[PDB]
Amino acid sequence: IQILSKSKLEKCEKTSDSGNLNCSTKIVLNLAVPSGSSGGEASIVAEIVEVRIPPVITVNKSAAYALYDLTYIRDVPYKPQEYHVTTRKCEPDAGPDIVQICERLRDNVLEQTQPICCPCGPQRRMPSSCGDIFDKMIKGKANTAHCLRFPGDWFHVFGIGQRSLGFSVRVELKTGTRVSEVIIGPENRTATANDNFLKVNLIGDFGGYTSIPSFEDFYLVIPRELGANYSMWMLLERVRFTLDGLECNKIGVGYEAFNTQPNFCSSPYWSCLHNQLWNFRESDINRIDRHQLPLYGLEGRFERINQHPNAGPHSFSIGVTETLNTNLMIELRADDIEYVFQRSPGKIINIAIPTFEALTQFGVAAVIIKNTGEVEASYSLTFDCSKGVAFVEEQFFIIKPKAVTTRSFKLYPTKDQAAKYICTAILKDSQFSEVDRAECQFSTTA
Amino acid sequence: IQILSKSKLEKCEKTSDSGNLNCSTKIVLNLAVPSGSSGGEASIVAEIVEVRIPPVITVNKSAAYALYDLTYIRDVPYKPQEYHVTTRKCEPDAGPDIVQICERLRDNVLEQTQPICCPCGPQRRMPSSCGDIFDKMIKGKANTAHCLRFPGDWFHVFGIGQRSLGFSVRVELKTGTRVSEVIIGPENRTATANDNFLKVNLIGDFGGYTSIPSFEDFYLVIPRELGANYSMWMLLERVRFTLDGLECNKIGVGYEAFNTQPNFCSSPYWSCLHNQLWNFRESDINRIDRHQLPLYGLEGRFERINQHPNAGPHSFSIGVTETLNTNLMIELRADDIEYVFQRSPGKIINIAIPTFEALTQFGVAAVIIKNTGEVEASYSLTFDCSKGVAFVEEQFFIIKPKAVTTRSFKLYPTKDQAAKYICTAILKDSQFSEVDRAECQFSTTA
Amino acid sequence: IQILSKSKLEKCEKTSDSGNLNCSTKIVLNLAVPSGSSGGEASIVAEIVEVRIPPVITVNKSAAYALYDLTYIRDVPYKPQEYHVTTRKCEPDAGPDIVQICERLRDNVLEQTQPICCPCGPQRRMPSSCGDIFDKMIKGKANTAHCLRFPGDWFHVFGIGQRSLGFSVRVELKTGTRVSEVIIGPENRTATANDNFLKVNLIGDFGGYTSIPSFEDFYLVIPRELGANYSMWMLLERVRFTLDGLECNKIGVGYEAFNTQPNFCSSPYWSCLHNQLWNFRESDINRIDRHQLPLYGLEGRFERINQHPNAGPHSFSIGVTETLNTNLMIELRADDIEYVFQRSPGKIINIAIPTFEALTQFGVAAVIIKNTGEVEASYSLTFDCSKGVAFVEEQFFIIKPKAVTTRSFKLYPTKDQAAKYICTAILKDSQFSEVDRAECQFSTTA
Ligand SMILES: *[C@@H]1O[C@H](CO)[C@@H](O)[C@H](O)[C@H]1NC(C)=O
Ligand SMILES: *[C@@H]1O[C@H](CO)[C@@H](O)[C@H](O)[C@H]1NC(C)=O
Ligand SMILES: *[C@@H]1O[C@H](CO)[C@@H](O)[C@H](O)[C@H]1NC(C)=O
Ligand SMILES: *[C@@H]1O[C@H](CO)[C@@H](O)[C@H](O)[C@H]1NC(C)=O
Ligand SMILES: *[C@@H]1O[C@H](CO)[C@@H](O)[C@H](O)[C@H]1NC(C)=O
Ligand SMILES: *[C@@H]1O[C@H](CO)[C@@H](O)[C@H](O)[C@H]1NC(C)=O
Ligand SMILES: [Zn+2]
Ligand SMILES: [Zn+2]
Ligand SMILES: [Zn+2]
Ligand SMILES: [Zn+2]
Ligand SMILES: [Zn+2]
Ligand SMILES: [Zn+2]
Ligand SMILES: [Zn+2]
Ligand SMILES: [Zn+2]
Ligand SMILES: [Zn+2]
């Protein structure tokens, strides 16, 4: 937490146009509140002059998350299946004795559920044998039955709309020996406490240097209320789905699309049943087995999934990993202000960077730091690397004197050839002066 | 409008490196100007000491809009149509007497406009009858003619580039009994008034908590210069279009794509003519008939379409529904400053929330508020709901003492089952203290 | 550079909970640092009172760029080619004497590399002649061989992740006649200089009015380590690629997709080989030949490609053309502060606007300006146009007294018909007062 400005201003309240206005001199403060503040790192003490204990203010800010406004579209099956039935005489208006596993649903009769009969032999959809003339003359002409059924798991298809940034700002005030809590957020961004002495107003946020995804042209697939919890949750492009169920080889095929097919008995098996949810889940599994980031699945690429307050099953939100400075304005009924901050030295314990692939993989530099002081203090950490590795953002954090904090950085090299780099981790305190420096051996595999 | 800081600073102008510099002490102010301010809610009076009426400043800000830089690509038809002609002898180089409605355009001859002849009978593109041998021996062999024509409406295809935020900031100055207007925006963000006494500079905007769409991978279709005005205006994905006219079943098909088709007489009717503008318009109509938000059409999902100044037919902009705090800096040639704000009580008249579907629909809470005071004053409104409903952003507005304002909130429940919730609307004044509280019965349909 | 606030604040450092805290009164400054500042335009002189040369501070800021976190997916060929071989007896397990250019790769044997034999004559994939019965009775039955090979150039397919904003802020301090440099950026945003006298902290950025692309659903194709340097670099939609190599007519086709084709000998030539990298490169060439902006190619639409520090071949970044105000906080160990800015008059030399097409093209207004003064000073430029042309953002720049600067504006008309417009260019100094006005004749072609 850093004070942007301290200023004295005479605020005058007006109630009637004809009547007289009453004034009151207040002390307006502009604050930059970063995400992760607790209050135990810095305090703002107010000095009041009357014409006995001074009021102390401590500001706490929670981690940020991005909530996405979901709109329900239509239910979709996980694995649509095509069944082959090698029998004798075939007809779409047949019984289970000659169609076996195919059949037809009567939930009443459905003309699109009935199977399609194709001739026997090779070059056809299903390769079979026509048999002999004498077996054909009694049992009937050999035919293959093809049907579309939807067994197994089902998924919800949601449309990602606007993205909403959410958090909570706790303002603690000590008039004497008694505490008063003020909760400020995007939902409730204006508050007053203890007989109009305090005025907390949330103006906005100071622009970050890392983007938050919008997921504009994507749909979210949620399993109906094997693999991990959010690994089944996928973000797939809108063009990949067939909401009308009239398009082939797209997520959400219908019976009408499959039955109305160009050259059904000539086209290969499993046609009109390609690029489904199982194909996209399997492509992630193959990528995860090779120890790489998934392309569609949520788990692995996003941090803190659905860990937001007032959560639900049909709700989607991702954690904002970047530290954001939130512009807060505290307007006090005092004469002046004193800013009391806490400082405590710290040391870098050990940096753990594992060996990773040339460009298919990225680096993770786990840096654990201990507070060697006696009081809870603010900290800064810069992770500088060689010409090959791209710049990494500075990390802000508050460590208790009896605790440790693990801080990881994503390392991105620009070279293809297996090269050796050197990284220097610089730790700073509430005072922007360096407390400890550390080096680490870094190398990639071709 | 809220004052971030008030500060005295000695500004010194330099003209020559060798020469002497002249100083002047000025009073710099940092302001957070929200969208919707008029000036009648708060005033900033300057106190000048010389070695008679004080100058009063009032700042007005307009509602925000997002303008999209459109680039013309190519014209596209609304409904491309395939015509069937059941005749006798067929040939692509035939006359209108034996091709009827098909024919060919001579705007000169066009080899891609001529129809394609297919054999008679079933299993073909068009189901017909071959007739008898004796009718065939005189009139000719029976054939079906198929042709591609483009009748009806046409549309413009534009590429959405960068998004530009636009608004206007009016700065009113009263030196005596005479007014002076200063218009500040992203186009003109630096101004000075009345012999260098005033200095208005627009630094930037304070980060909002709601996203504005970019429409990156989308194209805008505009009808050529039934349905509503902007309901015909659609935002469709770039992959859905065939700008080259060589791809089948994509928006903007050509004659070449249709003529060069795999197994033309074997493939079903209306092939190469799927997923066109009419299919996307019809899918919106079906969604609107079921009282749900459209997927492609502009009207229904976006507020204030093309209501921006300096508008045109080949221009696109959407209104920014979220209130944005604009960072303005007023630098005055005075000794000090007095901030005179207006306060007027208000009461919640009635909350109107209609019953809506489980997840296919969202809620709208119409809250009408009256200014019970005597002067124009600023207001705040928080709409808190149960654990199931997600957080809604705080609304800022200015109400005249002889007027009312309707304020609607979008309600998003997280549960699928028909549940009953309770919502509490809290109204605040220019003073962040609550003026009126109101409750409402809330329930959804399964 | 503009001072947002100047404030005196007593900062008190705490080391132990039981122990006593030491105070120090500091002078906190809030600054809006725009991109392009050098230091020679304005200086901030500090006045220190002790109980001899004053410290002078000059702040320089570099131009901004947006860096995209690339993740490697798979290699892709530029032009996959299908070869036709008109021979006699054909078989997939044949020798080079009867398959000619087709053959098969043995890098060992590959069952998917072997060609496919199709019957002779018309209506087939390749139109040929079956010859005579007597030529067939000795040489063999006539057949056509079809094979898929990947000759020529190859490309890298990268997944665009998060966007990171990068720049550098230089803080120059003169204690006496000796200089001290402080480099502040998103990587290192906290610094202290000359025995805790200076405290530079980077809070964030002030919201711009122009968007920066995210490229969410796009992939970047880079040629393997004719056309320009970055013209071969393309941004193509994720749906356009077939990473699995199982889909036809999509970027990155495999042998399996081509061999497993519906009615191979019936379908037209070059099938399963459509919509490849060469098709997208050619569509840009045709657009560039007609003097229009490319759709996929990087060069032409984006400014300053890969001109960022710590660059590489597998790195992607675009220059931020919009001027951004960066919120910097300088906290000094002094009693007061004096702001000394430089002012120098300037004149508009000549405006060069070429005649362009109705809506397929956009305008470029090259405005060259000279500093007629004696010292390096800040400048402002507004380019107002008629009702038809949309609003253009104000441009900030610093010109040396012995130099000139060319400033171009993108002009977007809203009318389709060839109309004549009038544009007024207004130049301003460090003082927001107008120095020079200029008009220009403007017209478009239908
Ligand atoms: C902020 O306060 C909440 C309780 O209201 C607490 O759970 C949270 O841990 C505090 N923040 C920090 C960073 O300690
Ligand atoms: C703001 O409103 C929310 C929701 O009603 C509530 O939880 C919070 O405590 C409120 N803040 C204050 C300071 O009362
Ligand atoms: C701001 O001023 C314009 C006239 O310049 C006026 O039309 C507008 O209504 C004013 N804004 C408000 C919120 O009253
Ligand atoms: C800023 O420029 C625009 C366009 O020329 C104009 O409408 C506006 O009045 C200008 N503002 C001032 C303060 O002159
Ligand atoms: C800022 O300083 C660097 C050297 O550190 C210099 O190259 C650059 O030109 C300076 N910026 C400007 C706008 O002059
Ligand atoms: C900040 O860190 C970077 C990388 O180590 C370095 O180049 C820069 O000079 C540092 N800034 C200061 C003020 O030391
Ligand atoms: Zn038998
Ligand atoms: Zn569910
Ligand atoms: Zn498949
Ligand atoms: Zn007859
Ligand atoms: Zn038009
Ligand atoms: Zn259709
Ligand atoms: Zn011969
Ligand atoms: Zn390479
Ligand atoms: Zn092609």
PDB file of C-alpha atoms and ligand atoms in Angstrom, chain B residues 72 75 156 158 222-225 313-314, chain C residues 359 416, ligand 11:
ATOM      1  CA  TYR B  72     -14.706  -3.252 -46.458  1.00  0.00           C
ATOM      2  CA  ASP B  75     -20.622  -7.902 -51.004  1.00  0.00           C
ATOM      3  CA  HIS B 156     -21.978  -5.623 -46.938  1.00  0.00           C
ATOM      4  CA  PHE B 158     -16.865  -5.483 -42.989  1.00  0.00           C
ATOM      5  CA  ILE B 222     -24.984  -4.606 -43.055  1.00  0.00           C
ATOM      6  CA  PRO B 223     -28.031  -4.706 -45.438  1.00  0.00           C
ATOM      7  CA  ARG B 224     -27.630  -2.849 -48.805  1.00  0.00           C
ATOM      8  CA  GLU B 225     -28.481   0.902 -48.722  1.00  0.00           C
ATOM      9  CA  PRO B 313     -24.380   3.995 -42.602  1.00  0.00           C
ATOM     10  CA  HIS B 314     -20.932   2.293 -42.802  1.00  0.00           C
TER      11      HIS B 314
ATOM     12  CA  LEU C 359     -14.637   2.295 -48.352  1.00  0.00           C
ATOM     13  CA  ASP C 416     -20.059   5.472 -49.787  1.00  0.00           C
TER      14      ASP C 416
HETATM   15 ZN    ZN D  11     -24.077   0.530 -48.047  1.00  0.00          ZN
END
